[PDB]
Design a binder for these strands. Structure first.
Ligand SMILES: Nc1ncnc2c1ncn2[C@@H]1O[C@H](COP(=O)(O)OP(=O)(O)OP(O)(O)=S)[C@@H](O)[C@H]1O
Ligand SMILES: Nc1ncnc2c1ncn2[C@@H]1O[C@H](COP(=O)(O)OP(=O)(O)O)[C@@H](O)[C@H]1O
Ligand SMILES: [Mg+2]
Ligand SMILES: [Zn+2]
Ligand SMILES: [Zn+2]
Lengths: 293, 598, 608
DNA sequence: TTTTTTTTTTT
């Protein structure tokens, strides 16, 4: 509330146009109506309001004197500074270092920084043609499969196939709603000789969405939460990868339960756990690039 | 206005006739008012169907307000009492008045009673929970000024009240301008009181919704009626709680009726008629009931003869301080699809106090009794299991071979001594659980097979096998023509939704549930002259099962079967002494229970 | 996609005196086409409080008022609801007094007001908005007074009192003192029967997941339902509330922080998703009564052929799955007994025979179908598990899968990767139809009348066609009796079938009516045919011939035992075959349609 | 909204 208006209760006397002060400080309603002691209430119909957020600013990482956890400060944004920054940004605040007035020690106050200035630190038509002509050129196939594994060399078939998984087929819906897959799966069997970890890292890096996994797990779990003392649901990786690609190594190391669930997930393309208090479904839409041993 | 209503109620109270009294037209409330005036009675359940017989208008304006009217009535009777035979007119009340619901209203559910019926006469159905214990609630506080030698009173309405320090008598104040007055718990008046919660039947809830509760303030005479974990129907006003504008509400009970049997509690009308003594006196009364138990099920003429003894139960002795139980336990080992979970579901509904439990969906502490903590108080309390809630009745456990093996030895205690002795870390006690158990199980791996003998296609440790007086053993071998009759029975059932009419007709469930309760309380004896017959029979058994290659483990606990399986029969025939004809029936049963293997 | 109207605009075809005297003129409505005088009467014949208005009409009638109503919603809705009681007294003054006050919802197309809880800024204060999103909690319905009625036992008078709080459209905070002695002389006594209370709830809308920018914790908003709008929303829905926006201040100790809490005083609710198909056209019911009469010979076969065209072969299995989708008739005798009326199907076979496909189709066809696997499902998580609450800390019984799917379908794939201790938790809920739980502090019996469709891979990985049907299935003869139909989807390597199978699937990869089986089965489900003595003597014979081993054959093994439980699966398949014909009387052509299915599903042949 | 001790359901 910025411009507030009150009213008496018994005699119905009004005292309007009262202006609040900015920042985090309230207001002291009278008690001398001119009627019982504090006869004044707020009229909700007549009170102009403005938005306000409240952020939390942590100090840069390269300025901690390196013995402890960085300290942080509290901000107070206003009408047009709200919804301007997202947790994870770098900023430069110009504010009025001040104190809360909502009236460990005897005379201690709280403190914030009333922000009044903020900063942030950092497809095309013609681009379409370098895709068009490249798709149209006669030897369009090998030009990609040549530049998708520079370090590792030998047997371009194992690189020929990987070219398709990055594009994939198309998702069809028959009249019956009986949809069809739109992704592929690959297994690279053979000794672990570290020649394949490079390839996993590459395909993960050059993917629109992609995750390389060896935590919570791959598929969903049901875990007894300390706070709730009850079971909660943990969607793992294959529910976060939407259309993306998931890379896996050492296909015999994954937890027995987890391997069962990944089997069913590649079977049906969704994970549905029916356990203690959990009956949900999570659509798994990703691509499995597995490496065996 | 109400001044003219206090007359239109006095008329009705002094004028009402009734014919069903078995006599001539007497006065239903005419006798009541005299009894109340002679302090031989406390409550006066003014029915509302009877006001709705000559004045269907007053009923409309009672169930509309029901709070003023329940005071006009208690003033009308207050005036009429002296005319038949201290300072405030409420300390000398010594009676209370309750409305018995009008028949035209329909019993709502707890979810239905909304804010549009605050302050009206309602009727709810539910399951009791957390019934408190009786505590004295004050009504008229009596103070005394020890200085001026006086007596003063004040009446209470809220769940709280502020006492007095005045002695407002102007004389005591005027003479001396000083004096305090003490409270006193002699001249005052208390009244019994207990609060209890109700919950919805988890059946009549949306598919996955949480049941809602309501609070019931039973007080006066309705106390000690309802037991926790019970189906009940309540009739009372629906009011808000005193002390911003939102309000929490409770039901103020005026009438409480137990509806365990799915209809009502008819223990008062439970007496039999001479026209029924006709049947009970017939030659083969024992054989009519046997055929009228779950008639939808063809065959099994003998199993139904034993499931009746289980419902009647033998007699229990106590010589030289050595208790012997007087209940019967029965198991129904048998092949799949022989209608065992139908027989059990039927014996569940034919018992006053019954419980149903499944072996694979119940843990061993949930059968007997469990100690559980309250995160609000940190205090451990006891909570009865299935066998406790089924104290004087029957418990039913199907899927009995699939119950976990550590959750099954918690029954050995309840089957012999019929107590439950808990010594966990909050409690140390022995609850009383005098239940008779009836269980069903599949023999070895679903199906009996003739290669392996008994005791290896049954898989019960002898210690538990011997607890069962009758381990009945059913089989189904295909038969080119018996199957035909079974099918022509079941298809008739699915056509008409009833059983085919035999020579006679099964008795109603409501009537058998009374025939049996009358047949429990006989307590026959045993004649000495029979102790030589019985003995020989028992001896012969110990021979056969000792000179055979299939027989089970028989022990000195088998004799007490023969004994307690015959005092049941002799209890059906309404005799008061066991006769040599029932011993042979018992002996035949204990033989027709393992013949299905030869 | 932007929802700029509660009625989806794409396919809808298939002083304070001026306001009060303009609303009345709008509510006349007689002289143009009589749209609202056809609705006031309509609600009086149904005993409703409020009527829904289209602001789209207010625009065409009077633009100035339509704009002044979307920007000063309070002073305009206190004048609308007055000139509505005025207009209902102008039809039936007797009715116009039964109810304390009328209400008026809204619906139509607001220009920029169609906002999400993320865009609902503080420039919409006291302005009709139309918030969309998911409900994520509810409150406990509680009364709330709006008037009292007192009484003086001494003076025989009767005084009243009108109440008002900050959750009204007028907003004066009255005190709930409940006067007991107005004048010190006489005492008072409240009369609850003659007072007036109302309901009150408080729900929390939350932004849709697929509309969040995914970087934050999506925003929320608080709604205050009331006056028989109360139970109109359960957790997990997709609502479109249309209510005024309001800020409600406070003060704790004569000193107010400027910070306020803003709520939405709803005055209409709409479920966005249509979650039923009962709205058949009279043309549709005409088609249905035609099709049900055209040919009674071939309507079942014709129904089943069109069931899952995306699959080749498996005509028997489609027939039986249709029988599932219809169901039998649940008979409950007079004494209280009960006989189930459902069919439980089991399919075993080698990999890649479209089993999972049949399951995923039965899921979408039937309403209220629940999926489940054989490892992501424990024995207790299927039926019911005991837990506690976080706010109260007292135990309760969370419903498993097979209790949510009541009167529905439960699809269990890879039913064989389920441990022995987990199947046993079903034997009660697959035949008796209700789950019984006796845990530590819980004793309950839940209704779970459902039907099971299950798929299991055989032991040895592949069906060894030489061993026997009993050694290829691990299930014991107690569970094998529950499932009344066992289909061995054996895969055969003859070169012919693969040819047409490839043809079919490839044609599918080059892309009776589909949306008609829905209505037809949703209609033919309710019919309840009754046996007749012409067939009841034929079943009672085919069973007694099934039960005799000799009449079967030699070199023929039995997949499952024939008990007195297959007898009343004959009866169920029969009265589920005379439900497609909408026949209402089963005949000898039914009790023979359902016997060959059994003769085929029970006996298998062994090779060497 | 933290430890510590004790009972019972669940992965
Ligand atoms: N003799 C019979 N009379 C009437 N109904 C029968 C008979 N035999 C079987 N039934 C019916 O067949 C079905 C048998 O199911 P249940 O009663 O659950 O079997 P059960 O004895 O419990 O078998 P298990 O132990 O659970 S495998 C029910 O529908 C019964 O009504
Ligand atoms: N008879 C068939 N008709 C149509 N599609 C088939 C048939 N057999 C196999 N398919 C196809 O082959 C795949 C088989 O997978 P599926 O049968 O679901 O595996 P599983 O049998 O292990 O569940 C499916 O994508 C399905 O479309
Ligand atoms: Mg059973
Ligand atoms: Zn004043
Ligand atoms: Zn005195």
């Amino acid at each position: 509330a910025t411009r507030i208006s009150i009213q008496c209760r018994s005699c119905r006397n009004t005292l309007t146009n009262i202006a609040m002060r900015p920042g985090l400080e309230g207001y002291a309603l009278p008690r001398k109506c001119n009627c019982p002691l504090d006869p004044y209430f707020i009229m909700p119909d007549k009170c102009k309001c403005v938005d306000f957020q409240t952020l939390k600013l942590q100090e840069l990482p390269d300025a901690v004197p390196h013995g402890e956890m960085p300290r942080h400060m509290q901000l107070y944004c206003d009408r047009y500074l709200c919804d301007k920054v997202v947790p994870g940004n770098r900023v430069t605040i110009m504010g009025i270092y001040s104190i809360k007035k909502f009236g460990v020690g005897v005379g201690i106050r709280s403190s914030y920084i009333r922000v009044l200035g903020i900063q942030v630190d950092t497809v095309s038509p013609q681009e379409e043609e370098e895709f068009r002509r490249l798709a149209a050129l006669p030897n369009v196939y090998e030009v990609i499969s040549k530049s998708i594994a520079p370090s590792i060399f030998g047997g371009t078939d194992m690189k020929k196939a990987i070219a398709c998984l990055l594009f994939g087929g198309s998702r069809k819906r028959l009249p019956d709603g009986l949809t069809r897959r739109g992704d592929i799966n690959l297994l690279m069997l053979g000794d672990p000789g570290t020649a394949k970890s490079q390839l996993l890292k590459f395909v993960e890096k050059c993917s629109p969405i992609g995750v390389y996994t060896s935590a919570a797990g791959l598929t969903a779990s049901v875990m007894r939460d300390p706070s709730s003392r009850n079971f909660i649901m943990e969607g793992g990786a294959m529910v976060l990868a939407d259309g993306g690609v998931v890379c896996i190594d050492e296909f015999d190391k994954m937890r027995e339960d987890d391997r069962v669930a990944i089997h069913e997930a590649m079977e049906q393309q969704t994970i549905s756990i029916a356990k203690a208090g959990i009956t949900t479904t999570l659509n798994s839409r990703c691509s499995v690039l597995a490496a065996a041993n | 206005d109400y001044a003219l209503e206090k007359e239109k109620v006095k008329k009705f109270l002094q004028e009402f006739y009734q014919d069903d009294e078995l006599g001539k037209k007497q006065f239903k409330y005419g006798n009541q008012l005299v009894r109340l005036a002679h302090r031989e009675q406390v409550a006066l359940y003014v029915d509302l169907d009877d006001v709705a017989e000559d004045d269907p208008e007053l009923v409309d304006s009672i169930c509309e307000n029901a709070r003023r009217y329940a005071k006009l009535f208690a003033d009308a009777v207050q005036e009429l009492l002296p005319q038949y035979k201290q300072y405030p007119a409420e300390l000398m009340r010594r009676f209370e008045l309750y409305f018995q619901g009008p028949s035209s209203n329909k019993p709502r559910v707890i979810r239905e009673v909304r804010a549009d019926s605050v302050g009206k006469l309602v009727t709810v159905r539910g399951i009791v929970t957390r019934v408190s214990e009786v505590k004295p609630k004050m009504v008229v506080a009596t103070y005394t000024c020890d200085q001026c030698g006086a007596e003063t009173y004040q009446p209470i309405q809220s769940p709280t009240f502020m006492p007095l320090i005045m002695c407002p008598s102007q004389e005591c104040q005027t003479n001396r301008s000083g004096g305090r007055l003490y409270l006193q718990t002699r001249g005052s008046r208390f009244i019994k009181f207990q609060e209890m919660k109700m919950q919805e039947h988890s059946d009549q809830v949306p598919v996955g919704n949480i049941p809602r509760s309501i609070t019931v303030l039973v007080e006066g005479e309705n106390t000690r009626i309802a037991q926790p974990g019970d189906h009940v129907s309540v009739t009372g006003i629906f009011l808000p709680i005193l002390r911003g504008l939102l309000s929490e509400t409770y039901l103020e009970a005026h009438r409480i009726v137990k509806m365990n049997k799915s209809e009502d509690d008819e223990s008062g009308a439970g007496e039999l008629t001479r026209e029924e003594l006709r049947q009970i006196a017939e030659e083969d009364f024992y054989e009519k009931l046997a055929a009228s138990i779950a008639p939808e099920i063809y065959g099994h003429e003998d199993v139904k003869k034993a499931l009746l003894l289980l419902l009647v139960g033998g007699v229990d002795q106590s010589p030289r301080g050595m208790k012997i139980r007087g209940n019967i336990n029965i198991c129904l080992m048998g092949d799949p699809g022989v209608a065992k979970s139908q027989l059990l579901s039927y014996i569940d509904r034919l018992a006053p106090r019954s419980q149903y439990t499944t072996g694979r969906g119940s843990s061993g502490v949930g059968l007997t009794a469990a100690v559980l903590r309250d995160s609000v108080s940190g205090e451990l309390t006891l909570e009865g299991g299935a066998l406790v809630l089924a104290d004087q009745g029957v418990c039913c456990i199907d899927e009995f071979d699939k119950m976990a093996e550590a959750d099954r030895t918690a029954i050995h205690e309840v089957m012999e001594q019929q107590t439950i002795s808990i010594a966990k870390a909050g409690i140390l006690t022995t609850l009383n659980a005098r239940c008779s158990i009836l269980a069903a199980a599949n023999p070895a791996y679903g199906r009996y097979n003739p290669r392996r003998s008994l005791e290896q296609n049954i898989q019960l440790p002898a210690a538990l096998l011997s607890r069962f007086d009758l381990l009945w053993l059913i089989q189904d071998r295909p038969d080119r023509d018996n199957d035909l009759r079974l099918a022509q029975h079941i298809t008739y059932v699915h056509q008409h939704s009833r059983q085919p009419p035999s020579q006679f007709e099964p008795l109603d469930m409501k009537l058998m549930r009374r025939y049996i309760a009358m047949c429990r309380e006989k307590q026959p004896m045993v004649p000495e002259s029979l102790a030589d017959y019985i003995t020989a029979a028992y001896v012969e058994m110990r021979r056969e099962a000792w000179a055979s290659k299939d027989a089970t483990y028989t022990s000195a606990r088998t004799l007490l079967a023969i004994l307690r399986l015959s005092t049941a029969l002799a209890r059906l025939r309404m005799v008061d002494v066991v006769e040599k004809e029932d011993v042979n029936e018992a002996i035949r049963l204990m033989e027709m229970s393992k013949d299905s293997l030869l | 996609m932007l929802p700029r109207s509660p009625p989806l605009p794409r396919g809808n075809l298939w002083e304070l005196r001026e306001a009060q005297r303009d609303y009345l003129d709008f509510l006349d409505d007689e002289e143009d086409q009589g749209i609202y005088q056809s609705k006031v009467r309509e609600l009086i014949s149904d005993n409703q409080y409020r009527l829904i208005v289209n602001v789209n009409d207010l625009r065409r009638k009077n633009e100035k008022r339509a704009n002044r109503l979307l920007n000063n919603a309070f002073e305009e809705l206190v004048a609308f609801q007055r000139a509505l009681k005025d207009f209902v007294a102008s039809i039936d003054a007797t009715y116009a007094k039964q109810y304390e006050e009328f209400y008026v919802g809204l619906e139509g197309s607001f220009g920029s007001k169609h906002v999400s809880p993320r865009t609902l800024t503080s420039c919409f204060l006291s302005c009709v908005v139309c918030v969309e999103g998911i409900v994520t909690k509810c409150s406990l319905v509680r009364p709330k007074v709006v008037r009292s009625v007192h009484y003086c036992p001494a003076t025989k008078k009767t005084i009243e009192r009108r109440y008002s709080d900050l959750t009204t459209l007028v907003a004066f905070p009255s005190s709930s003192v409940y006067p007991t002695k107005d004048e010190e002389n006489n005492p008072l006594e409240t009369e609850y029967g003659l007072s007036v209370y109302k309901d009150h709830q408080t729900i929390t809308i939350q932004e849709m997941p697929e509309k969040a920018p995914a970087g934050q914790l999506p925003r929320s908003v608080d709604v205050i339902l009331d006056d028989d709008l109360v139970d109109k929303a359960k957790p997990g829905d997709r609502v479109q509330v249309v209510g005024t926006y309001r800020c409600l201040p406070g003060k704790k100790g004569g000193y107010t922080s400027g910070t306020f809490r803003t709520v939405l005083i709803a005055c209409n609710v709409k479920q966005m998703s249509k979650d039923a198909q009962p709205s058949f056209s009279a043309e549709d019911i005409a088609k249905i009564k035609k099709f049900s009469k055209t040919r009674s010979k071939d309507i079942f076969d014709q129904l089943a052929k069109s069931l899952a065209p995306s699959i080749h072969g498996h005509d028997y299995v489609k027939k039986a799955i249709l029988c599932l989708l219809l169901g039998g008739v649940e008979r409950d005798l007079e004494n209280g007994s009960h006989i189930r009326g459902d069919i439980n199907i089991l399919l075993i076979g080698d990999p890649s025979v479209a089993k999972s496909q049949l399951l995923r189709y039965v899921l979408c066809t039937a309403p209220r179908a629940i999926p489940t696997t054989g490892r992501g499902s424990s024995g207790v998580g299927l039926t019911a598990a005991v837990t506690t609450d976080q706010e109260t800390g007292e135990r309760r019984l969370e419903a498993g899968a097979m209790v949510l799917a009541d009167r529905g379908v439960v699809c269990i794939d890879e039913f064989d990767k389920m441990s022995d201790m987990d199947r046993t938790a079903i034997h009660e809920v697959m035949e008796q139809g209700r789950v019984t739980i006796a845990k530590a502090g819980i004793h309950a019996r839940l209704n779970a009348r459902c039907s099971v469709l299950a798929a299991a891979n055989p032991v040895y990985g592949r069906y060894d066609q030489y061993k026997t049907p009993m050694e290829n299935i691990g299930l014991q003869d107690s569970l094998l009796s529950r499932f009344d139909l066992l289909f061995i989807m054996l895969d055969q390597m003859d070169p012919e079938q693969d040819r047409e199978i490839s043809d079919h699937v490839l044609r599918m990869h080059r892309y009776v009516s589909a949306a008609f089986m829905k209505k037809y089965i949703h209609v033919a489900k309710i019919i309840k045919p009754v046996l007749t003595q012409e067939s009841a003597t034929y079943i009672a014979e085919e069973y007694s011939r099934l039960r005799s081993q000799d009449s079967m054959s030699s070199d023929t093994a039995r997949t499952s035992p024939v008990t007195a439980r297959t007898l009343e699966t004959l009866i169920r398949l029969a009265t589920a075959h005379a439900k497609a014909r909408m026949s209402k009387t089963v005949d000898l052509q039914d009790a023979e349609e359902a016997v060959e299915l059994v003769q085929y599903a029970y006996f298998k042949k062994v090779l060497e």
